[PDB]
Amino acid sequence: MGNDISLIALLAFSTLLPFIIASGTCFVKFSIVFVMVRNALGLQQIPSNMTLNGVALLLSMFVMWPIMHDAYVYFEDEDVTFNDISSLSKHVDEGLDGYRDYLIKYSDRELVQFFENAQLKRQYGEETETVKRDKDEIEKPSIFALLPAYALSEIKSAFKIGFYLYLPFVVVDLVVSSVLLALGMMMMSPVTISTPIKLVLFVALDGWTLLSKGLILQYMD
Amino acid sequence: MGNDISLIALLAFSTLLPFIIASGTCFVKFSIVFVMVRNALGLQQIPSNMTLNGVALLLSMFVMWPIMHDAYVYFEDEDVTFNDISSLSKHVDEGLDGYRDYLIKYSDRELVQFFENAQLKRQYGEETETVKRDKDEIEKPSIFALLPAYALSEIKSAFKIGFYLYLPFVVVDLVVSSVLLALGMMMMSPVTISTPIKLVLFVALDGWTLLSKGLILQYM
Amino acid sequence: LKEPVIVSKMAARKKITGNFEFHDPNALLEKLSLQLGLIWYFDGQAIYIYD
Amino acid sequence: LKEPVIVSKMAARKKITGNFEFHDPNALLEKLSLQLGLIWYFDGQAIYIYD
Amino acid sequence: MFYALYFEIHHLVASAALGFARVAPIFFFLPFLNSGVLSGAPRNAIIILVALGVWPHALNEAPPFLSVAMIPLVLQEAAVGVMLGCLL
Amino acid sequence: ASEMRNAVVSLRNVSLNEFNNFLKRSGLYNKNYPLRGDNRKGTFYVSGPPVYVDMVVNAATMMDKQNDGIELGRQKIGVMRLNNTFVGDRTYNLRDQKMVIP
Amino acid sequence: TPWSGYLDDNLQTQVTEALDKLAAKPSDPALLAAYQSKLSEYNLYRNAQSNTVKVFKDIDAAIIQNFR
Amino acid sequence: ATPWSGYLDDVSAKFDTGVDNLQTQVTEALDKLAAKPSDPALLAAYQSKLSEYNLYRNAQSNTVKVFKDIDAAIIQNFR
Amino acid sequence: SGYLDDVSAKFDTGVDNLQTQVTEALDKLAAKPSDPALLAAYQSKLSEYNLYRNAQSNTVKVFKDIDAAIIQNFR
Amino acid sequence: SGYLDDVVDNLQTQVTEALDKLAAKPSDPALLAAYQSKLSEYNLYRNAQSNTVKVFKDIDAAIIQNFR
Amino acid sequence: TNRIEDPNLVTDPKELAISQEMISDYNLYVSMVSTLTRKGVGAVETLLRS
Amino acid sequence: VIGQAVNIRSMETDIVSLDDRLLQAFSGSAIATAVDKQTITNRIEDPNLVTDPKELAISQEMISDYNLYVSMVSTLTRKGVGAVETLLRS
Amino acid sequence: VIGQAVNIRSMETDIVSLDDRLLQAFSGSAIATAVDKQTITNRIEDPNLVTDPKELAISQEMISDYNLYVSMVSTLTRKGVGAVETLLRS
Amino acid sequence: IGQAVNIRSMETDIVSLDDRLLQAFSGSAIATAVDKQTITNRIEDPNLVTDPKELAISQEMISDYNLYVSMVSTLTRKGVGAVETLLRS
Numbered sequence A: 001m002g003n004d005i006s007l008i009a010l011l012a013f014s015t016l017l018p019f020i021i022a023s024g025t026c027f028v029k030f031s032i033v034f035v036m037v038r039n040a041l042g043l044q045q046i047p048s049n050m051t052l053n054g055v056a057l058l059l060s061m062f063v064m065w066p067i068m069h070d071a072y073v074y075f076e077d078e079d080v081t082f083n084d085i086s087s088l089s090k091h092v093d094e095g096l097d098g099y100r101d102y103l104i105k106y107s108d109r110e111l112v113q114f115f116e117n118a119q120l121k122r123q124y125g126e127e128t129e130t131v132k133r134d135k136d137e138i139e140k141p142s143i144f145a146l147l148p149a150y151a152l153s154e155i156k157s158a159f160k161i162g163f164y165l166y167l168p169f170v171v172v173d174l175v176v177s178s179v180l181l182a183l184g185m186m187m188m189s190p191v192t193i194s195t196p197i198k199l200v201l202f203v204a205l206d207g208w209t210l211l212s213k214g215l216i217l218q219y220m221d
Numbered sequence B: 001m002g003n004d005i006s007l008i009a010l011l012a013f014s015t016l017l018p019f020i021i022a023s024g025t026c027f028v029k030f031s032i033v034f035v036m037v038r039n040a041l042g043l044q045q046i047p048s049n050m051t052l053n054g055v056a057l058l059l060s061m062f063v064m065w066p067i068m069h070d071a072y073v074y075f076e077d078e079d080v081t082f083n084d085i086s087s088l089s090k091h092v093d094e095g096l097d098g099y100r101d102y103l104i105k106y107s108d109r110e111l112v113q114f115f116e117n118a119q120l121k122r123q124y125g126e127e128t129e130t131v132k133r134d135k136d137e138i139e140k141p142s143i144f145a146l147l148p149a150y151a152l153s154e155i156k157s158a159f160k161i162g163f164y165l166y167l168p169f170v171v172v173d174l175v176v177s178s179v180l181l182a183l184g185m186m187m188m189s190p191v192t193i194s195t196p197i198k199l200v201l202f203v204a205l206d207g208w209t210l211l212s213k214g215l216i217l218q219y220m
Numbered sequence C, D: 001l002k003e004p005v006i007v008s009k010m011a012a013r014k015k016i017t018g019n020f021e022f023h024d025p026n027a028l029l030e031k032l033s034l035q036l037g038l039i040w041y042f043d044g045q046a047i048y049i050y051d
Numbered sequence E: 001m002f003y004a005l006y007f008e009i010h011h012l013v014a015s016a017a018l019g020f021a022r023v024a025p026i027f028f029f030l031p032f033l034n035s036g037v038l039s040g041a042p043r044n045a046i047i048i049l050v051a052l053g054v055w056p057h058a059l060n061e062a063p064p065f066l067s068v069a070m071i072p073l074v075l076q077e078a079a080v081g082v083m084l085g086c087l088l
Numbered sequence F: 001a002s003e004m005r006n007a008v009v010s011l012r013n014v015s016l017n018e019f020n021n022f023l024k025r026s027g028l029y030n031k032n033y034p035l036r037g038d039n040r041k042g043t044f045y046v047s048g049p050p051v052y053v054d055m056v057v058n059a060a061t062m063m064d065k066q067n068d069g070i071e072l073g074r075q076k077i078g079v080m081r082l083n084n085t086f087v088g089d090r091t092y093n094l095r096d097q098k099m100v101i102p
Numbered sequence G: 001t002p003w004s005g006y007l008d009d010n011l012q013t014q015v016t017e018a019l020d021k022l023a024a025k026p027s028d029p030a031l032l033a034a035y036q037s038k039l040s041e042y043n044l045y046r047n048a049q050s051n052t053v054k055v056f057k058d059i060d061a062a063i064i065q066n067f068r
Numbered sequence H: 001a002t003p004w005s006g007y008l009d010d011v012s013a014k015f016d017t018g019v020d021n022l023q024t025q026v027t028e029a030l031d032k033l034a035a036k037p038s039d040p041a042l043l044a045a046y047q048s049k050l051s052e053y054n055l056y057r058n059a060q061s062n063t064v065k066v067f068k069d070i071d072a073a074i075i076q077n078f079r
Numbered sequence I: 001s002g003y004l005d006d007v008s009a010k011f012d013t014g015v016d017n018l019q020t021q022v023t024e025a026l027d028k029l030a031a032k033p034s035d036p037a038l039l040a041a042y043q044s045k046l047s048e049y050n051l052y053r054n055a056q057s058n059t060v061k062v063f064k065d066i067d068a069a070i071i072q073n074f075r
Numbered sequence J: 001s002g003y004l005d006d007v008v009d010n011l012q013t014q015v016t017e018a019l020d021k022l023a024a025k026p027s028d029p030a031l032l033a034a035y036q037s038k039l040s041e042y043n044l045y046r047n048a049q050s051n052t053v054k055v056f057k058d059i060d061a062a063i064i065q066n067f068r
Numbered sequence K: 001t002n003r004i005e006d007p008n009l010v011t012d013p014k015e016l017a018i019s020q021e022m023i024s025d026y027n028l029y030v031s032m033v034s035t036l037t038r039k040g041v042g043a044v045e046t047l048l049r050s
Numbered sequence L, M: 001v002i003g004q005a006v007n008i009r010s011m012e013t014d015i016v017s018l019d020d021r022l023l024q025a026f027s028g029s030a031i032a033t034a035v036d037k038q039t040i041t042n043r044i045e046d047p048n049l050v051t052d053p054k055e056l057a058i059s060q061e062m063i064s065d066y067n068l069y070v071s072m073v074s075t076l077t078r079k080g081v082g083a084v085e086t087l088l089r090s
Numbered sequence N: 001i002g003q004a005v006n007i008r009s010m011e012t013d014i015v016s017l018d019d020r021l022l023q024a025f026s027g028s029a030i031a032t033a034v035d036k037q038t039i040t041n042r043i044e045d046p047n048l049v050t051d052p053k054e055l056a057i058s059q060e061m062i063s064d065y066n067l068y069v070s071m072v073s074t075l076t077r078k079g080v081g082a083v084e085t086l087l088r089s
């Protein structure tokens, strides 16, 4: 490296990288959807968490790679670009817009607005006018305000997707329970009978194909 | 120690090894099947996961051993001369084909091809007419395309096997319930009468040997 | 004004309503500055408005 | 044109339709360059086209 | 003053730590946040970020609680968090 | 066919045509994949099946290294009689000055 | 090594020259007095340089070893 | 734009190992000097050769030492 | 600035004028290299200089090593 | 210090004073010989203090980690 | 201290030995609070499940 | 004494986000460092500066101060990162 | 200045798979490294290069740069795999 | 000068997993035992410990030994480290 502080900052970033992936990337969503599927089928320990997180991380790679590559060549670029403190701080800030555009494109506008206003009222005082940017160009919000809005937005949508998948298995369960009561076999635990019907239903749907296709198509046109 | 960047690459690979085994090897399937056997017999804590996984890990080595041996002798034992980026890249890539062919044997083409197009990201949303379900191939897909298609195929296969394994034991206990309702004894649960029957049925079938043998025979 | 105008983020949060002429902009701009609480500078190339 | 053509990853996203006559390619290329917003160069062996 | 940024980072983490005591119980009760769904490395990373998103005071000035017995305080905050978890 | 190898070799002590003679005596030469370069210079390009390429590259490198033990620069001695003048330098002690003719 | 994007040998020849003059007439007091100075300065220059290059190596190494 | 890869002389060095000229010449010069320890023409030669041999041997040792510390530090970084 | 410059300066405010005197004596001597009266004075001044510069540099070295030890024990 | 707030002399003073006296006449052997031993004793004191503070903090860090 | 006395006293060995105590002790205090809160929350979760 | 400047009321009625506080700190440090390295190298190249006791005694202090500053920034940064790891890490 | 080359154009990402870009990066690094090690070794044996003060001042820089390059790569790869361990094992 | 080489040492086919261990273990323990012995008797011999051309060889031998044993240890530890995680998990 040509400069020492440029090196210190790089080692710090490389030391905090995993939490940024755990809280600001689609991995947070894929990881949830697969656990929801396992809950739905009524399984406990199989497939293992290490297998489901393995595929979740691989799939997240196809989606995040382009902006990490873009940032890499942007900071390697050898052409003369900055001279002085204001130009350096603007050069660094400008290099992050490739990722601010990502967070903003998937975060919920209402949450972004909440976390922004609640910071203004910390710094400048609660009497500062509550913005109500109801028709909005959110003026490059701070990333510390933007990041938790993304995290809660992805949790919301992953739960939403997971809900839909239950409904067939719910049907299966209530049907089986009704036919057993119709025969009076009150002492039979339904779960023994209903588990294989769920498995064969999911296999006939080919769930993992449909699901992994759609989850990726949501991120690219 | 040769080239030290090759040394770094070797230690890195050695660190990631258990996740590759956990997500790109038939351990994935054997681990699930044995646990489902325990659930179908309705046992909650015995045999231990320590035992079932130990067995699954052993069995999977027999299947994978032929490939690791070839990769080893190809890379490490043979001294070779190479001199530039392109010659080295080709040399390295050619070594993986022994594993690549296994993945493509057990993976499903339209999904692998989808992931390839997704990582080129070209012209995306290409239609089903851009494909025509061709049959015979000299394509060489990426390994980052092949790994997840493999995982998602193995899991589905395991679920399918688990469908059949449950059936006989489901019959065994509905018969017991019906006989108890033919008598008056509707206050008593089947489970304490039903469990030993399942255990004898399973030993009379010698299910462990038929399972292990048949699981191996698929990969021969 | 015949010059580009740059408004700081903080100053951009205020709202104004009514019907304005802009006949003599340099005078009007000064008057409005003291009513709204703005400060402004002019380097010869662009007008900068801040809170 | 009698030259191999290399098209940038970015420019390859654009689409076109119609019935075209390649009577004088250097001229047609110059025409469409401005209409579509492309830039191009010729080193003597191949034609490179960019956004 | 040279060390001021170092101390300003430590004031931040002390505030986040005392906020976790009040935010985590809510994540225990709600059906879309409990560890039946959200588990592993994401869980703490998200809880901490939320707590920092809602802490009421400027993060860069010394926390006011340095003079107080820590256990009575932590239990107080956890009880408050349990009450909010029930009402939500 | 996809396995074809190619390499550039540079020799300091041995000519291309000298190496050719070695190949021919060996019975290793192959007119389908001959060496390409300047007979008079020491740099050439070769391409072909793996075995042939590897053998060529190794052999040539060893030939060149071993020729660091050979020597070319044998000195010679010429004896030349002067027909019109004395070989030695002379000193003329002028009564006023000593002067030298080398 | 350059910091990417940031905007922004005579003494050797002089010593060689003085050596060549001196070698032709080792007994000239003026050539001796001149060579003594050129050689002394060249010596100091080379030492100061190599000490500084080591000091920078050791700072970069300490930084890496702190996070490693 | 990127600097060229270079090209690798894989075979040459490991079998270029062989008896150095420098040690041979040092021992020869010593054997000439020991026959007549008072000849200035021989002393002047031996001073120079012995000096060069000292520098060469040190430079080599310090280099081997540096290259092997890097490898020990890599392995100790991963275990 | 800094403390090590404070230590360095505590010498230079200690020897008021030596830095000048040495050069002045040198100019005089250079004017008449064979006057024993001049020679005798230059020997003294030059020696006093040599000693001042050595003591200064070794002291700065020692205080540098004390600080470099403490900043390592911060870890 | 001249100050106490209600609610001998140390090596730090003695070194500063002996340096101050020396710098007035850097070439006196009595003063030099008096200063060598004060600078040495100050170097030893200031190392031993920091090394033991470091030991007590690593003890407390290990306790907190052991109960994690 | 904000623009009073002076900055950058990286260098005097007497004040630099006072900073070592504070820089260590505040890091330990902050580390301790992090564990106490986890323990407290874990105790509440333990009782509520059981 | 040459070209002195100080900012006043830095925090009296405006406060920066942490996001910016880190960025300004990084920039103000990185440029000062790069200029100090160039100054040292130039003081070594010039034949009139590496041969005069008065100029060497000045250069020794510059090298000492550079080395102490970069070591202190590195240590504090590493120690401060450690605390965030101990906070986030489950 | 004796012999030099540079690679002017880099291939479009639209035609190259994700693992090709890795193989291609790795190979280039491994070769530039073996070539630097060899160069240094050869400088240490030419008796003209090993005994001239001008040339030694160059060898010292070359060996310091090689050392820093390899320490950098070996550190960042370890951080890289440590992230994967943290996400999957946890 | 008294030297011997054993040539027909190894079988290159695919072979049962149990014996690849025994053959690797045995070949390695043999190599390290002889290497260590030659190192020590290079130090004990007075004609070798005092010649600058010989010392330079001993330096390389010592370093190569150090690295080889460091690497066999590291890879074996990561080998059993994989198994214990797959089984515990």
Ligand SMILES: CCCCCCCCCCCC[N+](C)(C)[O-]
Residues within 6 Å of the ligand: B172, B175, B176, B197, B200, B201, B204
């Ligand atoms: C509900 C009827 C259960 C009848 C027993 C089912 C088969 C398992 C036990 C008998 C196996 C036959 N065998 C081997 C004893 O001959």
